[PDB]
Amino acid sequence: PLIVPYNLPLPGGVVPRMLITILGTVKPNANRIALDFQRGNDVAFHFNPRFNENNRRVIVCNTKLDNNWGREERQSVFPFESGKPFKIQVLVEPDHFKVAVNDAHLLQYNHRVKKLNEISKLGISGDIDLTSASYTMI
């Protein structure tokens, strides 16, 4: 078991073919989960499943540059469930991050922050118990 908010260093930054695997359980009555890939103070890729946003379940993706959020990308396919275990996989590809939850493809986020080698921290927060956070090269 790991403490949330959790900070996972990505030594040397992200690189294509890097695979991050996050295992946890969603807390009962969860409101939000967030993954934040950080380049310093900037958030290169924010992945933010919201459990109740006007009585809708929704995934928000965005980038925060110089403290300003940009244009949001919204996915209404929502594979998370309160109280239940999940696996999130982020595969880094040349042009996008590819996210799969519970072995099923969820979304792609085109790279807005282009200096991939400077995205060197992954922050994990929200209404989860965190079992495992790691990476490997596929």
Ligand X SMILES: OC[C@H]1O[C@@H](O[C@H]2[C@H](O)[C@@H](O)[C@H](O)O[C@@H]2CO)[C@H](O)[C@@H](O)[C@H]1O
Q: Is 137 exposed, middle or buried (0-12, 13-18, 19+ CB in 10 A)?
A: exposed
Q: Which residues are annotated as a binding site for a beta-D-galactoside?
A: 69-75
Q: Which residues are annotated as a binding site?
A: 69-75
Name the minimum Å distance from CB 68 to ligand X: 9
Report the distance separating Cα 23 and Cα 10, nearest Å: 17
SS3 124: strand
Report the distance separating Cα 62 and Cα 48, nearest Å: 8
Name the minimum Å distance from CB 64 to ligand X: 7
Nearer CB in complex with ligand X: 68/136 = 68
Q: 84: which residues sit within 8 A by CB, 6+ positions away?
A: 25, 26
CA 37 remoteness from chain centre: 7
Nearer CB in complex with ligand X: 72/93 = 72
The site for ligand X (CB under 6 A) is made up of: 46, 48, 60, 62, 69, 72
Nearer CB in complex with ligand X: 23/58 = 58
Name the minimum Å distance from CB 31 to ligand X: 11
Name the minimum Å distance from CB 46 to ligand X: 6
By beta carbon distance, the residue nearest ligand X is 62
